[PDB]
Symmetry: C4
Subunit: 332 residues, 4 copies
């Protein structure tokens, strides 16, 4: 594999069509799904030359741990849909690559099993039917050694997935929500923040004022995201809000972005727009479908190579230097 698109082609060959569509699809007309890619394609980096590249490092410190790249595996539900080892395969490869893995509330293997793999596990939370149950789930994740709570804030309910409707898609009997909802509010965020000393990261922020409120609420981070185009069809891409959000929070929390990251060059664009790190979703599942744990390992090695290549070609010996690069919009 020499590009992430090689992995997409391999996953399409192996997966049943309805499972490929569950993974690939977005809500509605898929306008936001497509716009995540268009938005990245219109950004161009202005590289710097002739800087010292003696010790180029792709590492970052985030949520109290060193990560090998400015990236984490996004929370993706039900990973046993894509390979029999599901989340365990992905978490093992992420651990070995030094990349944080986000355990999903809707994981097909229990959070405690995935956490036992080791590595840097984060836990993605959906707000449950009441406060008490929600907080018990946070406390399970904390007791199991998860290092951040990624509270998803853009799913009062799941969006309208027309591919799933048209396919009549349902989980096979052999895939379940192994950790087993009401809409979250700012009060829910405060209940979580008071229940844990782990950093709380709000995933799905797009409005500048919501990013500011997240800092005021005590969030340790946010993920600027339209949920991979799966939630509001017509929601702006996160990459189009990122620069304005980074300026508004002015260092008050970590600012991650996701949606459409498909190369180390896209990582570099995100960092040059001010992101602390990215999440990557679909490509990790393509690699899992294609070749299991070893597939995920190969993807992460490829992304690491692409990130180091892009950083050095742009004159950046560190991720901080990449955040100081300038960009220019172009017409594609």
């Amino acid at each position: 594999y020499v590009s992430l698109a090689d992995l997409e082609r391999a996953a399409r060959d192996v997966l049943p069509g309805e499972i490929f569509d569950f993974l690939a699809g977005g809500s509605g007309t898929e306008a936001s799904l497509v716009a995540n890619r268009t938005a990245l394609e219109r950004v161009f980096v202005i590289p710097r030359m002739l800087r010292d590249l003696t010790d180029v490092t792709t590492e970052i410190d985030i949520f109290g741990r060193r990560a090998a790249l400015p990236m984490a595996v996004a929370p993706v539900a039900y990973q046993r849909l894509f390979h029999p080892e599901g989340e365990l395969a992905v978490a093992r490869a992420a651990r070995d690559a030094g990349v944080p893995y986000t355990i999903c509330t809707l994981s097909s293997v229990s959070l405690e099993e995935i956490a036992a793999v080791g590595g840097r596990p984060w836990f993605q939370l959906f707000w449950l039917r009441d406060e008490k149950r929600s907080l018990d789930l946070v406390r399970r994740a904390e007791d199991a050694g998860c290092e951040a709570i990624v509270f998803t804030v853009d799913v009062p309910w799941m969006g309208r997935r027309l591919r799933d409707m048209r396919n009549g898609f349902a989980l096979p009997e052999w895939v379940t929500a192994a950790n087993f909802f009401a809409p979250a509010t700012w009060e829910s965020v405060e209940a979580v923040r008071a229940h844990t000393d782990l950093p709380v990261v709000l995933k799905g922020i797009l409005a500048v004022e919501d990013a500011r409120r997240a800092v005021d609420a005590g969030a340790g981070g946010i993920v600027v995201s339209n949920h991979g185009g799966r939630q509001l069809d017509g929601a702006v891409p996160g990459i189009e809000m990122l620069g304005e959000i980074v300026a508004a929070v002015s260092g008050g929390c970590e600012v991650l972005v996701d949606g459409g990251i498909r190369s180390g060059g896209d990582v570099l664009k995100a960092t040059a727009l001010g992101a602390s790190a990215v999440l990557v979703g679909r490509p990790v599942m393509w690699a899992l479908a294609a070749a299991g744990q070893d597939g995920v390992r190969q993807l992460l090695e490829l992304l690491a190579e692409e990130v180091r290549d892009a950083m050095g070609l742009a004159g950046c010996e560190s991720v901080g230097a990449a955040r100081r690069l300038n960009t220019k919009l172009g017409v594609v």
Copy 2:
């Protein structure tokens, strides 16, 4: 049906080609017809998160009546072209959905029959050969219980419909103008305003100064519209003028928009640009052609579901909150 495009495909299968073209077509090169869609596709919504969605409501109050959605059925002529029950089927489904139905001056069933269906009937007026006849038609609509006069102001004459020319299209003998023209001016508007206490809504306004003059003239509303691309070929889409018009009238009348609304997400975009409500034309006729009254019912139920979905995903418990959303133009 899971999208309005499913209804278009079904209507194309059933209707004679020349009738499908009468419905689908625009004037000239169809530049304005296409631009209505392009313009909506370039708008992206910036959703809000973590707001209370305990009692999401899609209802609005407009022209003195509660409507179930921020939408009405646009005036479309000669609906018996599309199904034998024509306007009666559409009006019955609109009544049952709580959606206002605009009775056309060129209806193929008399306005009194359509009004007897009940619901929230509005009446669309074309200015007749003289003032006296025009006002008699307004008074018929008022006597029959219509609740607003939608005065169409962009048809001094019908535009050049090249599909109809090329097809040699003419009304079948079994379709007539069952209520049975000179160009309207501002004096015509004043004659109508003085003849009725019903709200007068000027449909087809695109210039900011014409919107301001409509308020000064005593209009209770305007529809920002290029007539679905059927009038001036090269007229700007209404959605591209909407924000500037909403700012200029500054609450002095209701501001509706139409042209190309094809989903609840498009309704949300229109409201976020400041519209009080939208009109929907062609899709309602696709549903009528496909399955009669029940088809229209299914379309309106689908639109209601899409509007509620889009509003809640964007953090809006009411249409007023959706009008306070911000948008960003993107490149598609």
Copy 3:
């Protein structure tokens, strides 16, 4: 024929391919040829409603004569390539339509014969090998009753016509320059201006400062034009410079535009951007090729109908009112 594109299709069917290419082609990569169309397609008109249309007139006064439309036939060389009656057929139809006809220096029938047809003949000048010969040609045109000298200023030499090169195109023996060059300068313009009391119109102006200098030089008009994309490949379309040029000359001369006008709606866009009138080139030759004089008559009747339709739908009872319309750029 219901659109100018119907005429293009008919001309393509009848003309030898190399003659069709002589007519259709531009210089180089044809970037400027294509951009003339793209530029018009991105302009949208903001129409006005409810104005008095009792006496809509498409007439203008220009260069001391009333014309039936804000348009003239552009100078196109060698019209016997397209039909045996060549320039005489076109000039007869233009006369009968009340539209000025521009006689070309490279006409295939002598200027005196074409002028004898009557109508409103203008004469297009290329600067000859010396001043004396050039001025004799101006004086021939004046003696024959031409009413303006359209001095072409963008042909120090003809551009690189790759279609003509690839086809090995040459004039058939039966087509000649029946009126029978050195590059023109501002001194040439002054020599022409002092030699005639006819208005001198500089055709091929694109720079704002050249438009201002044209007024200072005593020009009665300019044509804002890239020569139909046939001269500098990469020259900006005239329609993209028109508004800035109209503001800079501030009524000091007539400002015409050409390139890509293909409908009455395009005429309306040009006038709303400030043009006094347009020239139309290729479509007139399509009509000539398709059906001779009667073809040109049908084209001019179609354009007249489209111009009146577009003006009235936009609320304009006169061309002056159309020049006061506003426009908005869109994304096509």
Copy 4:
């Protein structure tokens, strides 16, 4: 051949696919390779009319020598891949056309042999494993009569060439680096500047501050360039940075540009954006592949004709006048 695209078609017919891909390809997704062309296509020139064209000259003075055109042959490695005479064929044709030829550090014929052809040889430097070896290579070039050192500053290492990976491309045994690396820094530039009195030209500058630093460092020129899209995938095209860079250096060094120049009209656009000269890479190799030295001669004669044509049509009797032309961005 009547366009550079004719040469591309001829080269594709003759070259082995993997060699054509080595020549054509870029890094990563080839976003920067494509953007070099898109960026030029969006620039339009505003030509001037009626200027004296008695003595149009395409010549420039650069780095102390008169060149026949505002262009040089870019450094392209391993030219024996494309024709058995390789660099000697290209250098002979460049000499006879009066165009500088840039000898590559990775040439397949030694720099002394290529310099013995005569003409205006420049030498492109890659920084070697240490300072001493690097400077010996500079001194070889100087001793052999090269007239400028074109220090490539955008290759700390070669980018990721996915076509070469997919083809498994490697140099044939019959092609070697006949002059036989560590990443360059500003200290390397100063070591070169102190080692030679030849002008040092930094090739691969895209950031405005790097252009300013190049002047401060004593560079005699820069080439604004993304390395033909072969280095950072997502690097901005040089043509999009050129105007801002020309303003920032404000005459302190020569400012060249490359990437995607495919006609004399593209040369004119580059000069109107402020370039002193362009480099041309791939097209020169297409001509070499197609027909050897004579092919390169024909390409250079064609480019000379196109440059003179474009300059005169734009009203420019000299390259300096072309640098004073204005441009407008369009939508393609």
